[PDB]
Structure formats: structure tokens, C-alpha cells
Symmetry: D2
Subunit: 317 residues, 4 copies
């Protein structure tokens, strides 16, 4: 039987006998994603160019509006907003969502794949909601995922039941389930990082990469892929296996990427898919945050590859 994202969320919902609040939130987000996809693919661009005589802002506005009006959220953290948004009393629900509405967008000039990253938490207690409700480790995530706007638009959604991939059929505006209960490869053949900054690498990253290009065990060198758009690189890592790194270098002791709405959601997907995600010192999902916009170093991917990185990291102490 054909399955759609809306249908799959409603049946998972009916199974868990929940109130429907998580379904309303996910459906609202699904609508936002289709709106973002439409804009990203430049639908209606001819009007801008004067046929009848911003994108990251629109993306944020779309996600903000869709979630507020969902009556399922109370606290919203976005890459585009210095402070958490507190949902007005009347539209309040029990969920905290942290999102990146259009990751990769500063490089949209070249039509690079971009994406939307999201993670959903249950609010902490009865206390009037505040920014603190967002300061939660990944381990608390109820659901997470992303929409990649690549050659086609795909939504990846991870929850307790696992990871499922839905392709947007733009002819009908519907996410079709194409990959069920997906699991990452145990070990891959591709590593992904910005090698351009080799100079600043932690000695362990240097040795790990060296092991990829010159294995001392006669096996084939890994290929390298690095798009520079996190959703794109993480998606390829999920689909093909391998390793993706944005490591802590001595000048950036906490990485570049953001914990709340890039690192945590991706780590949740990875683990739900049977891969791993570490900062080097600990599981990404175990980091306890003190700032909504704080950074984290991150290495994720196939378990065999991330265990191999960790083993090297342990050696260098």
C-alpha cells in the first residue's frame, strides 16, 4: 500500500493513542516544507523579474507561522532568531521545536542543495514556557529530521519507531514513503569534511584522514565528498554510509555547527538509523546546553567508521 507522510503520522499516532498534538505539529511542518521547496525551486520567479511589468527569511517565517498556528508548540528556537520565540498564550502547546529553516542558504547562489533541519522536545514542566525549555540534551528528542531540497525534495523523519524517508511528489504536493525503517551501512567508503582547513586540524583528525587516504592494511582508499551543505552531506552519509566530520580545531574548540538545530537532530537521525554521532569526547545527544546558539563539534556516520575515528581520538588522549 502507498503511504504518505500525513497517513503514516496518523497511524503511528493512533497506535500510540496520543492526543494528536504531535501529528498536528508534524503536518504543519510538512506544509511549511512544501512551501519552502516551492520557493527554493524558484516557483513564481518570473514575477520578481518583471513579467507583469530573503529566502532564508521566508523559510523562517513559514516555519514560524506554521508551528505557531499548529497549536502544538510553546517554544521555538531558530537559527534566524537571537532569542527563543515564546508562542502567544492562546496558540500554546506542549512542544519545543528547534529548527534551521534553510541550512546551506548562504551558498544558494550556486544552487547548492539546501535543507531544513528540525528537532522536537516535550516542554520541561508546567512553568510558563521560556528559553530554558530548549536547553535539553538530544537524548530528550521526541522526533527529529530534515527536508533536503536537492535534485528532488525529500523529508527524513526519525522517531522511536525508526527512520523513514518520504519523497515529495510535486505533481500532487504529497510526501510518498519510499524508504522504510532505514538503517545506515555498518561501514562506508566515503569521508566528508572540509580538507581545506588541514592546517588547523586536531592531530587525531589528521591521523584519521591519513588512514582514509593511505590505509596501512592494503584495502581501498575512501572517496571524499564535501558539498558544504550539512543536510546534503549528512543525507549522502545516511544513504551511502561513511563518515561526516565537523571537528573541534584549536581555534574553534566547540566546532562551527549548532547543537540545538543542526547537530542534535542529525545525531538523532543517525542513532535511530543505527549509526553514531560523537563530539569526540561524548555522544552529541548527551551534551547539556547552556545557550540556544551554542556550537558543537560533530562526527557522525556508519558505526564502524565513527568507532575507528574514536579509537584514534582515544590514542591522542
Amino acid at each position: 500500500d502507498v503511504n504518505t507522510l500525513t497517513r503514516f503520522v496518523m497511524e503511528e499516532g493512533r497506535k500510540a493513542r496520543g492526543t494528536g498534538e504531535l501529528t498536528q505539529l508534524l503536518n504543519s511542518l510538512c506544509t511549511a516544507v512544501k512551501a519552502i521547496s516551492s520557493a527554493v525551486r524558484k516557483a513564481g520567479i518570473a514575477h520578481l523579474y518583471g513579467i507583469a511589468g530573503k529566502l532564508d527569511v521566508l523559510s523562517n517565517d513559514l516555519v514560524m507561522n506554521m508551528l505557531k498556528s499548529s497549536f502544538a508548540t510553546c517554544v521555538l528556537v531558530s537559527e534566524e532568531d537571537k532569542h527563543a520565540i515564546i508562542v502567544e498564550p492562546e496558540k500554546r502547546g506542549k512542544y519545543v521545536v528547534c529548527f534551521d529553516p534553510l541550512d546551506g542558504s548562504s551558498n544558494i547562489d550556486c544552487l547548492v542543495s539546501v535543507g531544513t533541519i528540525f528537532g522536537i522536545y516535550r516542554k520541561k514542566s508546567t512553568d510558563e514556557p521560556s528559553e530554558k525549555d530548549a536547553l535539553q540534551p538530544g537524548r530528550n528528542l521526541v522526533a527529529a529530521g530534515y527536508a533536503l531540497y536537492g535534485s528532488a525534495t525529500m523529508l527524513v523523519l526519525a522517531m522511536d519507531c525508526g527512520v523513514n524517508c518520504f519523497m515529495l511528489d510535486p505533481a500532487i504536493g504529497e510526501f510518498i514513503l519510499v524508504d522504510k525503517d532505514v538503517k545506515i551501512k555498518k561501514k562506508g567508503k566515503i569521508y566528508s569534511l572540509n580538507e581545506g582547513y588541514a592546517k588547523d586540524f586536531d592531530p587525531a583528525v589528521t591521523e584519521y584522514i591519513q588512514r582514509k587516504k593511505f590505509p596501512p592494511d592494503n584495502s581501498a582508499p575512501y572517496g571524499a565528498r564535501y558539498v558544504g551543505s550539512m543536510v546534503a552531506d549528512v543525507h549522502r552519509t545516511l544513504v551511502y554510509g561513511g563518515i561526516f566530520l565537523y571537528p573541534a580545531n584549536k581555534k574553534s574548540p566547540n566546532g562551527k555547527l549548532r547543537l540545538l538545530y543542526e547537530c542534535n537532530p542529525m545525531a538523532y537521525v543517525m542513532e535511530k538509523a543505527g549509526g553514531m554521532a560523537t563530539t569526540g569526547k561524548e555522544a552529541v545527544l548527551d551534551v547539556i546546553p547552556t545557550d540556544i546558539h551554542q556550537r558543537a563539534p560533530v562526527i557522525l556516520g556508519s558505526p564502524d567508521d565513527v568507532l575507528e575515528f574514536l579509537k584514534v581520538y582515544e590514542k591522542h588522549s
Copy 2:
């Protein structure tokens, strides 16, 4: 005024008082590219998943381009990455142009939603003889027109001709290519390098040193950033937009590189040069190589002239 691919080509076609054969061919190419875009974006996939309840994308793309160009009445010889021999347009349908194309480059990785693209190169038929494969064995310098469609976050057609490089965005709401960047030029010098470093162990000594300089400059400037989508169209378009360098060079294991000359390297080299950039095999100009085999490979280094020169410096230092 608002300009569209078709408006642009008819406009240029009139300025030069041509027959309209090249215009008819581009129009057809544009129709096939919208159809490839639609399918790449997975419109109608719900039916394949049994919503009511065929072809692989590379095959469909090939059939779309072949069939559009044939029926254009503007072509006589078609070479595709997908077909071993040149296709010889049947006589009733024959025109004066030779097209070499890769109908869906980068498709071997379409499983992870990577940016894919269509690449094309157009030649005037030289000789007087019945058309044949040999007509496609023209050096890059003979190209009347070339470019590519990139099916990325959005769809863009890049069209290069004698008058420069023009970038058209597809508005899928109306199915028009909108001219959004006129007469494009690449930066003299960029801050990105693009190649598969995974295969460093097989690098040409010259490639190894060039890359080491990018990562640890001797003049202590800031090191370049690295990017490699692994899809040529995407890597070459970024090169064109942010400047820098893209490499797919020869080594011992592949003395002639991996990328194809007629339908990948030539068209991208032509684009690069019309945008005032540089494309080299290391020993000669990509555009100057005389082909002997329609599917022959070429090493390619292309991008900002200052990066390409700097690579040649290092390549010369190693003979």
C-alpha cells in the same frame, strides 16, 4: 524588460540574420531540459508507488534529448554518453548541426539527491559528405554553442555562445527559463579548490604539491576552502559563481583522466572560456585537443585564470 530563453535566442537569431536552425535546436533542447527537470524532481512518483495501483532517469533523459533534437530538423549527428555509436539522424529530419551531450551527468549518485545536470555542445557540420561519426570529431574550438542544465536547489540553464555566458532560471510555475544573470564572468582568483582528495595516494606529484600549497601556503595567506559535490555540473557551476578551481587531472593509473572530452570537458571548457576563465589538460587547452574517439577521455583543470596558471606553474616545475 523580462527575458526568457526563447526570447533571447530569437533576439540573437535576428541580429545575425540566421535561418533559425540554431534557434529551433536550442528551443528543443530547452523543452527536453524542462522534461528532465520535471522527472528529476520526481513529479508523478506517487504512481510508481501504487497511489492508483517505468523508465530509469538516465535512460529517460537520453530519450528526451535524442527525440527532441531529432525532431528539431536542425541536427544530423548526435553523440550521447549513453550510446556507443553516433546516431545518424534520418534524412527527412536532417539539419546542419552536430550535438554532443550528457543527458544526465552525475546520475550514478541520484540515490542521495545530489545535484545532477545536462551538458551539451553544438557544432556545425564541416564536410560535404553523408553525415557520420567523424563529424563529431571536431576540436572544442569549433563549438558554436555549449552549456549545461543544473538540476540543483533550483534549475538553471547556462548558455554560452560567441556573445558570452547567460544564466536562465527555470520558473517551474510557468515552464519558462528566465534570464537572471547576463554575460557572466568568473573571478580572476577564487578561494576554493575542487577535486577528490580521497585518491591522494594516486595523485600526480604536481597535483600533490598544488593541493599542499592550497592547504599550507608558503606566502602564509589564508588557506583555500575545499568543495567536491562529486557531480561535475554542480562543481563547475560553483566554480563559475564563486570562482576558484576544479580539477579532474591525469595520473599514472588514468593517463588521460576520467571525464569525457566531447560531452563533458569540451562544453565546460567552452563555457569557462566565454566567461573569461581557463581550462587545461595540463599539457594543452582542452578546446584544442583533436578527438579521435567520440568517447575518449581528457584530464581537466578549469576555473579562475589565476588559480589555473598557479597549477600550471607547479605542473611545469614537475615537467
Copy 3:
């Protein structure tokens, strides 16, 4: 607040504290309507004309398959099928659905508006599901409506809460709520029927139509519109007021329109809009059917006009 069909239905569903079955059915139906729309609008027609080297049947398959896989239905009556379809046991839910997957497709050659009409009942007994479960008077309906594939695609949904119209935004495949709680005008200015067949008219219809064209007082005669496509004429009757007629006569004593999946859901929509629908002898919604494909006469629309028609009808009784 922006509202969609999915969000609307989940909202009305949580208010009523129902299980979700109705909502899964409406979501499935809505997905089918999007697919019918895309095909009606000829998306992908270039492939059939050879760019690379049934519509009534497809519309039927889309609805049948989406409804079957909704888990919300047990008996399906279609214009297109001789007998009722009984959903296999693993898939059985509580609703009986009666539909016309592509009303008006008869004249789709001239690109006249076509539509999808549906009516939803609850199965009444715990008997094994059979055709008989579809033999309910329209008073028994839980939901009814239609999709109109016209200049735009619109979904009109009637429930106890009233009639709501949703406009499909094809950019994103969401039906947007555009008219809340619609009511028909008390009296209209438009009469709609096939006047070409006047020689066969009942003498009551003849006189009623004669009075529309030749008022006894000094009032404006009525204008006339007849698309010949039932969804289009009914939707116009809904928005502008007036009367639509496909009445009985000597040659066709039970009219020509089908009761289960044409007259009943239009009668329902009309009555929820504060309008009327009669056979001439009784309300359409009170007819007890004995055959799934039985015909009914229908005269519907503004209450003042239908009451007037009934006045004239009775004069010839």
C-alpha cells in the same frame, strides 16, 4: 490563521474526541482528489504525445485505492462499478463511501468542468459487510461533498458543523480554507436545466420555467446557465443562489441522476448550506434506496426557489 483541510479536519476531530477514522478517510480522499486534479489538468500529457520517442478509469482507481488503504472504510459504491466493493478484512474500517470519481467526464473532450462527488456513511450493523450497507437514506450521512475541477480546484466539504470550501494551491498541494460556514442565498436569480428537452418536460416544469422567463409582476426575469456538468452547476447554485433541476418526466419517472453518489451528497451539501433538495414528491435526503445505482429526480438550491417550484409542482399534482 491560515487553515488547510488536514489541519481543519484534525481540529474538528480532536474537538469531537473521535478515534481518527473519519480523518484518515478525508485525508485519503483529499490525496486522491489532488491526483485526479493533476491528471485532469493534463500534467505529463507530453509523454503520451511522444516527447520521449482512461481518465474516468484512473479517477476511479485513485479513489478506490486511497479509500481501501485508509483503514477507515468497509463498503465502496462507485459510479464506475456494477456492484459494491467490499474492503478485504485486514483493511476494514467503519465507513461506507459512495462516490462518483469523475462526474461530467462524459464531455471532458471540450474541457468542461468535471468533479468528484462523495458521501460518507457509518456502517449500521455488525453483519458481514455487503452492498446493503450502502442502502441508507441521505439523512444518515456523516459527511458529503465534492471536488470541482474548474478554473481552479476546489473541495467543498459538508458535515454537521456546516459547509466549508477549500481551494487547492497547486504550488504546494494543500487545500486552503477560503470560505467558512457557507450559506446559500434565500432567493436566487438563475435557473439551471437542460431546456433543449422541453417537449418532454413535465407540465409543472414547463410552467415553472415559463414563470422564470415571464414573471407575472414587474420583477426581472431569471438568467439561465447550464454547464451540463452536475458539480459545476451545483457549485454555481451554491455560490450565486438559484435553482438547478434534473426533474422527473413521463419518459424518465425517476430522473436520470443517480441517488447514492450524485443527488444525496448534493442534497446534503445544500441542506447544510440552508438550502433545499427535493424529488418533487419528497426531500432527496429522505429517499430509502433499494438499488445502489437507482435514479432520482432532483431540484435543488435556494429555499425560496425550490418552495416556489414545489408550489407549481403541486398545482399539477
Copy 4:
């Protein structure tokens, strides 16, 4: 061999060895139509209804700006504008274009089919361009036709070579040629007019219609259809045969439909497809306009139908 509007026009443009100016006019009109089609199908309506927190006017702007920018036109007349628009000198071309950018749009509240109608003349006078330039009889037309935004969008183009029908495939934004060298039936079985004006009909019309309902030879009575939107009524007349009438009445002593951009284009299409269009007095195409917004009575369709009507017009002087 698949054919598209742009390709067909180029092929035709090359045969006749023309300069390409008309091809640029037509391509520009084709682009305008796709943009109107997309607005009429309400793409991006979600943004108007607050998802991120006038159509005849837009249809007019699209057609005007596309025509102006084509360099192929000098004088433009539009249903929407009081006076002829005189193209600025730097953009001037040789063609005069009369159009109704969105016909039937007054009833679009009910999602009735709408359309775009155009007629194209070569400028005949050597005077500076002015309104007079648009005042030629329809006999002078070089090309005419319409787009019908029905259940799908079709462009109908009529020129010297006859009438051709193109279906818009909105997946790729290309009009695909679907019916070549179209001919209307010699005699039809449907008549089309607003019978609500029966009180104002002159005796010839009244008699003609009587015959359609009560044939004096015991052939089958005609069916009646009247969408009330001219493009739809005329397209059906084209596709199925029969007759479409809009005679004069007390509100419209000179008739209702506009001669320049409603009656001429349709008459031209009708004549090229082997049909007829009359005012009762003379061919619509032979009427010599004096005002750009002047109206005309029109009776058009199958030849044997218009001939039968003209006989009855004769019998009443």
C-alpha cells in the same frame, strides 16, 4: 512526431520565410497565457491566506507587458483599458493586437471556465500609430484564437493554414499540439444561448429556438448548454458542433459581446475551422468597426446550423 506551440510557429515561420516578428509576438502571448493559467489555477494562493504570516488586472498586465516587450506590436486594445495603448516608440513593431485578457472573469467566483481571447492584425495605415489602427474588419486578421482555462488549459490558434489545438502540459510548461487542422461538424446537436432573455428575443431567434426543441421533421430535439463564459461555449461549439447565440436584447440593443476582441477572434477561428459567424445582417468579420469597445450580436457555429438560423432571419425580413 510531438509538436509544441513554439516549434509549430517556428516551422510555420520558416516555411513562409517571414522575418520572425509574428513568431516573437505569438511566443510572448504563449508565455503570458501560461502565467495566467498558473494564476487562475491559484498557484501560491496559500501566501495570500497567511501561510508565512486582482486577477483580471494581473491577466491584463501580463498580456500587455509581454506584448510590449516582444517588439512585435504598435497598438494594443484590451477589454480592460478605455483607450488603445500606443506602444512606446523604441518597442514598436508592425502588429495590432486586440485582446480580452480574462473573459468570463466576472463569474470566476464560481470557478467557471475562463479564457483569454486575441486577434492580431498587421498595421495597415502608414500614419503614426493610433486607435484607428485597431479598427479594421475581422477579414483583415492575420491570426486569432484563445486560451481556455477549463479542466485543462488549451490554446487554440487559427491562421491561414487553419485551426490547431495545443494542450498545456503544466508539468513542463509547454503547449503540446493535440488536434491538427481542426474542422467543425457540418451540423451539430446542441444550441447555446441564455434563454432567460426569451422575453426580449426578436421573432427570428424565438422561432429558431422553438425548432431546436420541437423539430418540424421529427428529428431529435437539440440539447441545450450555456456555461455563460464565451470561450467555453465557443470551444464546445468547436469541439462538438452546434450553434452559439448571443443576440441583441433590451439591455443590449447593439448586442452584448465586444466585436474587436470577442466576436472577431471567435469568428475567425470559426471560419478557418469551416464554420460560420453572423450578426444576422452580415458576417461578423465583414463588420467595419468605428469604436474599439463596440458590441455586436453574434450567432456562430456549424455551417448547417448557422444556415438554418439565417433562413429563419430571412423569413422575418
